[PDB]
Amino acid sequence: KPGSLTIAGSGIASIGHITLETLALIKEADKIFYAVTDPATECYIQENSRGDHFDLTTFYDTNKKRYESYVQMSEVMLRDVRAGRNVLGIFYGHPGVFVAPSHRAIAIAREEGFQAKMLPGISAEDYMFADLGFDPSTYGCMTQEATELLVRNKKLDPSIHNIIWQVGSVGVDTMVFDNGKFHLLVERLEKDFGLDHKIQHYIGAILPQSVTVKDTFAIRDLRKEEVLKQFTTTSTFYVPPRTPAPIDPKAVQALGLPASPAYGPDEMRAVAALDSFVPSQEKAVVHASRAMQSLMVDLALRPALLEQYKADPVAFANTRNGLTAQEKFALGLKKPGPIFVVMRQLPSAIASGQEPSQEEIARADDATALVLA
Amino acid sequence: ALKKPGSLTIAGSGIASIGHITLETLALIKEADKIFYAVTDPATECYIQENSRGDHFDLTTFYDTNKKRYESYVQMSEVMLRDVRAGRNVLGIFYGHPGVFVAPSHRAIAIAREEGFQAKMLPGISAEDYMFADLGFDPSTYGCMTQEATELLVRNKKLDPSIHNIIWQVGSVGVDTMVFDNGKFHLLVERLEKDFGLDHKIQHYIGAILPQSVTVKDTFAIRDLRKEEVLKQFTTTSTFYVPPRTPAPIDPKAVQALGLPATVTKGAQDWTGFQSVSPAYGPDEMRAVAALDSFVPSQEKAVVHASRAMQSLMVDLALRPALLEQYKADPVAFANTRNGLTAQEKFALGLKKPGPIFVVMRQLPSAIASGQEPSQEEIARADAALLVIVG
Numbered sequence: 089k090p091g092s093l094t095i096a097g098s099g100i101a102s103i104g105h106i107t108l109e110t111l112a113l114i115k116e117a118d119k120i121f122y123a124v125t126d127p128a129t130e131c132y133i134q135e136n137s138r139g140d141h142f143d144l145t146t147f148y149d150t151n152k153k154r155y156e157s158y159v160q161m162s163e164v165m166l167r168d169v170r171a172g173r174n175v176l177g178i179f180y181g182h183p184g185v186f187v188a189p190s191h192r193a194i195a196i197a198r199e200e201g202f203q204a205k206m207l208p209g210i211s212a213e214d215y216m217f218a219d220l221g222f223d224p225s226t227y228g229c230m231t232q233e234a235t236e237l238l239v240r241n242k243k244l245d246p247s248i249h250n251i252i253w254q255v256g257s258v259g260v261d262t263m264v265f266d267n268g269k270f271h272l273l274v275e276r277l278e279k280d281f282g283l284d285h286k287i288q289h290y291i292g293a294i295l296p297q298s299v300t301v302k303d304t305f306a307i308r309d310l311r312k313e314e315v316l317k318q319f320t321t322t323s324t325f326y327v328p329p330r331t332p333a334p335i336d337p338k339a340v341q342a343l344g345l346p347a348s349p350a351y352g353p354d355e356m357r358a359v360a361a362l363d364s365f366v367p368s369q370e371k372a373v374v375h376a377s378r379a380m381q382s383l384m385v386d387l388a389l390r391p392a393l394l395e396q397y398k399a400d401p402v403a404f405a406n407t408r409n410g411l412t413a414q415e416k417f418a419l420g421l422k423k424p425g426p427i428f429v430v431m432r433q434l435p436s437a438i439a440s441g442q443e444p445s446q447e448e449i450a451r452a453d454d455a456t457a458l459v460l461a
Numbered sequence: 462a463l464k465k466p467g468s469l470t471i472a473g474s475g476i477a478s479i480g481h482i483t484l485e486t487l488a489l490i491k492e493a494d495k496i497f498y499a500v501t502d503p504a505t506e507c508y509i510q511e512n513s514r515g516d517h518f519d520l521t522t523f524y525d526t527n528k529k530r531y532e533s534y535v536q537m538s539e540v541m542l543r544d545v546r547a548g549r550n551v552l553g554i555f556y557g558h559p560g561v562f563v564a565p566s567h568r569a570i571a572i573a574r575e576e577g578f579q580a581k582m583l584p585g586i587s588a589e590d591y592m593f594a595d596l597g598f599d600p601s602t603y604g605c606m607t608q609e610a611t612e613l614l615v616r617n618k619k620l621d622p623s624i625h626n627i628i629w630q631v632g633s634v635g636v637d638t639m640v641f642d643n644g645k646f647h648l649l650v651e652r653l654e655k656d657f658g659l660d661h662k663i664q665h666y667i668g669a670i671l672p673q674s675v676t677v678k679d680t681f682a683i684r685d686l687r688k689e690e691v692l693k694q695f696t697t698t699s700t701f702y703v704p705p706r707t708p709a710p711i712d713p714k715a716v717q718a719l720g721l722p723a724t725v726t727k728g729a730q731d732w733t734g735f736q737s738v739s740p741a742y743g744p745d746e747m748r749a750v751a752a753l754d755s756f757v758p759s760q761e762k763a764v765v766h767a768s769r770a771m772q773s774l775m776v777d778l779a780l781r782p783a784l785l786e787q788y789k790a791d792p793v794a795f796a797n798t799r800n801g802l803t804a805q806e807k808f809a810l811g812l813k814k815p816g817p818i819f820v821v822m823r824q825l826p827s828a829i830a831s832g833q834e835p836s837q838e839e840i841a842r843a844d845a846a847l848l849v850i851v852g
């Protein structure tokens with residue numbers, strides 16, 4: 089069953105947003121098909137590759153339906169998969185977020201019996217959270233494409249975070265972007281939020297020379313020629329909530345829950361106690377052999393090795409004789425919980441020379457995690 | 462334009478152990494004076510330590526039972542800010558995206574900026590990002606609402622069944638601390654029942670953190686959610702995807718008003734199997750495929766074309782903040798230190814604008830063949846890749 093499809097992202101910022109696993113793939117893939125937004129990233133991908141690559145953006149044209157371009161983008165990848173190549177597709181940002189050819193190609197490859205998968209990348213939304221500094225999770229956060237919201241007659245909910253993508257291409261199905269229908273989005277915004285509500289125009293920095301765009305505009309300004317002009321195909325709008333929904337006290341109770349200056353009294357207490365805090369109980373610290381660390385890095389970054397490990401974990405462990413007997417045992421189980429037990433130990437036991445028991449390792453809970461809300 | 466001022470950068474580790482770390486983040490791990498981190502797996506933790514300058518602190522040491530979360534968060538922020546104030550290049554790292562469900566990060570950045578420090582958050586791979594990749598849906602096809610289970614309930618929000626929905630923290634409805642419980646999970650199930658009915662299906666998602674983890678992506682009918690064998694699967698890392706039950710129709714009048722062709726009758730395709738799936742190779746797709754080999758663009762397209770000096774510099778500026786700061790302080794002088802640059806590249810760089818970069822780093826193959834370089838005017842004047850359509 090030779091031939092495979094992996095689709096990954098390059099993120100938004102030139103080079104810096106690429107993930108370690110993606111860089112590894114770029115180095116290993118037989119052929120790379122890419123659609124990226126800047127020459128430095130393009131060059132970086134080419135230079136790190138085995139030198140067999142194709143620019144998917146060559147399928148666009150001024151007056152050509154983008155849908156046709158997308159079907160062609162998927163198809164060139166699938167042709168090589170069918171020919172037995174290990175194919176990598178790279179799309180800027182996250183390759184599954186506002187990207188048609190990626191999901192299409194993966195579905196078709198899978199249908200035809202080939203292995204296919206998508207890796208996450210840094211999206212424009214991810215960039216926006218970091219740049220504008222709001223936490224979705226507070227209020228919740230709605231993502232929508234500007235044309236899609238209009239053609240389906242949706243209403244925006246003014247109690248939540250709203251993010252509107254492709255604001256610069258309203259009603260455009262080709263590659264000519266004149267903002268000819270942008271006014272229709274403005275109308276939606278006016279009706280849902282009123283004329284005085286403020287939105288943010290967001291463009292995350294693509295190149296080192298770029299400056300983040302995060303300008304605030306009252307909705308009443310959006311029909312101004314000088315404002316309108318600034319909205320390109322790169323533009324995203326952030327629309328903060330106008331009125332958060334009130335807390336329902338009955339829900340609070342049912343959930344069993346209890347019924348601003350930087351350094352208030354509470355914070356000053358926390359800070360004063362910092363230097364002296366002693367935990368209720370001994371916390372485990374990381375404690376792993378070089379062999380264990382080397383292997384875990386290898387498994388994260390080398391898919392061929394991960395495949396070998398999954399096929400026969402006990403034999404694979406036996407190729408790394410630097411592992412402690414406990415690490416070998418844990419790895420042989422091929423489960424996450426045992427890893428946590430061997431790679432983290434109490435300082436008191438580390439001092440005792442005491443390694444976790446077979447029972448402690450095999451008993452580990454598969455879960456974990458820590459919440460920071 | 463600085464010499465020894467502290468700075469704060471907060472970055473993510475992403476979700477999957479090691480592999481989700483971004484290049485700019487790894488670069489900072491290597492270069493930072495001090496790293497404060499809160500990550501979920503030991504392999505990631507060891508990787509951060511081993512790549513560092515060896516000055517690091519585990520932020521999770523401030524957690525403890527009987528100790529309120531908020532006190533921990535303040536302490537977490539404070540340890541970072543102290544080192545910033547002492548003139549250190551400080552990195553904080555949090556699981557996933559450091560701005561999604563993370564209080565200490567926003568607090569630290571706000572205070573740092575107020576006190577006049579350079580303070581920046583870098584994006585990381587979120588649980589949501591992992592979900593789109595693993596479950597294979599695009600938020601854009603129907604729109605996508607993301608929210609926390611407790612918050613949805615506490616504000617009496619209704620779920621919209623015409624869109625994609627993502628619900629965080631299903632495994633600990635109404636309980637933080639550490640006594641992670643599913644006693645109030647039935648309240649979320651009631652919400653789902655009201656909004657979607659009993660037969661609608663949800664997906665239970667856990668993205669793999671360790672190489673040993675397997676992706677959880679099981680489909681359950683809402684009627685199944687109270688079954689003991691089903692409840693038992695939900696943990697603190699669990700997220701639900703609720704696919705649209707009743708997507709809104711394309712309004713032919715709205716299509717008209719938008720100036721789109723009357724052929725636009727369906728939305729963009731979702732491939733998960735939760736919606737009806739058109740044939741992959743219908744007439745429209747077959748036409749595009751048949752046209753592929755002989756496609757010739759109306760105008761000649763530029764290709765990437767830049768000196769080694771230009772590529773070397775652009776990579777350095779992406780990955781080396783100190784160098785970027787130097788470049789910004791005096792772009793012309795900086796460009797003059799890289800004599801491998803073409804005259805055009807030096808001129809473009811001196812302008813310190815993105816538009817000039819695109820001009821010098823891309824060229825028509827015809828112009829390349831005839832050795833024509835862009836003019837000073839073409840460079841000086843700084844006046845699309847969309848990958849989805851509704852049609």
Ligand SMILES: Nc1ncnc2c1ncn2[C@@H]1O[C@H](CSCC[C@H](N)C(=O)O)[C@@H](O)[C@H]1O
Nearest residue numbers: 181182185186211212253254291292321324
């Ligand atoms: N630099 C940038 N800043 C802000 N939004 C951006 C952006 N680049 C792309 N976008 C958004 O993304 C849309 C293109 S669709 C492709 C999105 C990409 N796959 C991702 O994960 O982000 C744009 O119309 C805009 O809404």
Ligand SMILES: Nc1ncnc2c1ncn2[C@@H]1O[C@H](CSCC[C@H](N)C(=O)O)[C@@H](O)[C@H]1O
Nearest residue numbers: 557558561587588629630667668698699700
């Ligand atoms: N491995 C995993 N797979 C799926 N969902 C996960 C996950 N880890 C965390 N989550 C989800 O994320 C919620 C908040 S914790 C993770 C926050 C992190 N900063 C991020 O960028 O995503 C959890 O309640 C859970 O719903």
